[PDB]
């Protein structure tokens, strides 16, 4: 049904609070962060190039927790 | 020897162009990005908190390249 009859853009359409990132996929040549929305149509693709400006603090933080780390060499 | 006798801060001391981020280390319970400098003392430890504000673009982009997604849950 989507909130409000008036057509609304994609990610960060109005300015709703970011719930939590739960997706990431590289399209033609740019990440497509799957932004989650509490009220809005949860989950939506957004070009990394566009997302970075929307909220770098959010994206940067997402990677921090999702850090696996390779392997420390010290033979 | 360091450029200029006058003491200079750490990362983003004056405002020299950022060559390229080498990586990141969780020092003191906080991720730190080693900013590489072309003219300045190449490589310097900087807290994620300070780095994000200095240049989120380079920061976000760094992970974008060194990114890897896990196996798709759905069988």
């Amino acid at each position: 049904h989507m909130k409000e009859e008036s057509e609304k853009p994609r990610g960060f359409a109005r300015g709703l609070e970011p719930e939590r990132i739960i997706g990431a996929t590289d399209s033609s040549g740019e990440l497509m962060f799957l932004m989650k929305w509490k009220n809005s149509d949860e989950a939506d693709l957004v070009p990394a190039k566009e997302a970075n400006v929307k909220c770098p603090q959010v994206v940067i933080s997402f990677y921090e927790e999702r850090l696996t780390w390779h392997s420390y060499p010290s033979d | 020897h360091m450029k200029e006798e006058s003491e200079k801060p750490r990362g983003f001391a004056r405002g020299l162009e950022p060559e390229r981020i080498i990586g990141a280390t969780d020092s003191s319970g906080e991720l730190m990005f080693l900013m590489k400098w072309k003219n300045s003392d190449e490589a310097d430890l900087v807290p994620a908190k300070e780095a994000n504000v200095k240049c989120p673009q380079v920061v976000i982009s760094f992970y974008e390249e060194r990114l890897t997604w896990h196996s798709y849950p759905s069988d």
Binding site: A24, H70, Y72 | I22
Partner: peptide, 30 residues
């Protein structure tokens, strides 16, 4: 299949790989 082309892709768990900062330092003349 206009702008909203994306419908199905990956839904796993993103992870970043990093080798610290000065973890590796290959050298032969040493």
């Amino acid at each position: 299949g206009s702008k909203a082309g994306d419908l199905l892709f990956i839904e796993k768990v993103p992870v970043v790989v990093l080798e610290d900062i000065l973890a590796t330092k290959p050298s032969i003349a040493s």
